Symmetry: D2
Subunit: 122 residues, 4 copies
């Protein structure tokens, strides 16, 4: 239902770029490029979305993951975003995210950052 | 590096079952079956992991997503887990998760649950 | 240091109102009135802030809690906000929050909502 | 209702110590000593709890904050815990927490850690 609405290039408030294709079957595949952190260039992402969302004005739930390893750098971390796609003139993906770093067991208390990203098509 | 350690069947403290294959390239693919919530049977999951983790005793960062739609039910929601794989006699995936429900804009404040799951091989 | 900057009336993006006094000693006391949810009128809040923050342009860490019981209603829940005060012409408190509901042990997986609020003086 | 159950000394899985008094009116006051992180000795805490919880076996919602400044150290951070008290032979406070560090605006994306603590009386 939102396959066409989701597919494409999105940008967040940090200036990061998310390029995604939504599959008819609920798949999300693409690339992510972060404007911040221990990252450079594009990184693979994968995820899932609700391909048959409610028809009552609700958003479409979705999520995706990036492991922060590519040919340039390995940040020994992974971020997951969970959120919803809200269609309309000013389409948005509103997300919250969890960034986990690989740690030793003694530091595991301090292993996960939490934040929020809002993506637009502009 | 942890491709063999991750691949297989894992169980969390709720009695949910995660069946995953880790790809050499950082992919995670599989199925999830929740012991709780608006769910039945298996659901597709996808995700990513750090395929070249630090060699200093750190865990391996990873994450994955499930959209809660399959042939039996559609919960109009998606969960992402972010965490790390810790190998050894008692291997564990320690995760935190974010479950987003599709909502209207007025209810979007209340759209995301947060929790934590710990997965073992037993 | 930010005692005067914090003290006063703040409003978030939902239209909620936070009225706080910051003590020289790091205390926060006041009242919260939510524009949404199972709430009416004002509720007690308490919290803490860093009364000697870094002088390098960093924000001032702070947090506070509301238990959602007052003389009108009891929502059997509590929210904590964690964030930072950023002073300047357009002062802001940027927060993330965790709302826990009282649950049975079987439902405890689904006991905590996560979100984010941004408070301004206007 | 749980004023007597909450009041006292609690310990988490890291070996941290939380000493709290619960007031009839919903207040929590006390001290926290962390076994980990940029902390030493005791730090003031304050918080709130549901003083009239549901009678159907549900837990009692509660939260509290610590700003990580005392006479020994100032970590320019604050943690909030949100959770519930579950009474009975093996009483527990099950919490999730948000730790915010003071940051510059450029680093604010990376300002908040998320975790979970479970407190017992032993």
């Amino acid at each position: 239902r939102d396959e066409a609405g989701i597919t494409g290039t999105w940008y967040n408030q940090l200036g990061s770029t998310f390029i995604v294709t939504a599959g008819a079957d609920g798949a999300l595949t693409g690339t992510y490029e972060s404007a911040v952190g221990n990252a450079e260039s594009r990184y693979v992402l994968t995820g899932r979305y609700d391909s048959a969302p409610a028809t009552d004005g609700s958003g479409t739930a979705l999520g995706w993951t990036v492991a922060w390893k590519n040919n340039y750098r390995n940040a020994h971390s992974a971020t997951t975003w969970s959120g919803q796609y809200v269609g309309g003139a000013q389409a948005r993906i509103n997300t919250q995210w969890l960034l986990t770093f690989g740690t030793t067991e003694a530091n595991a208390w301090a292993s996960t950052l939490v934040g929020h990203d809002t993506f637009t098509k502009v």
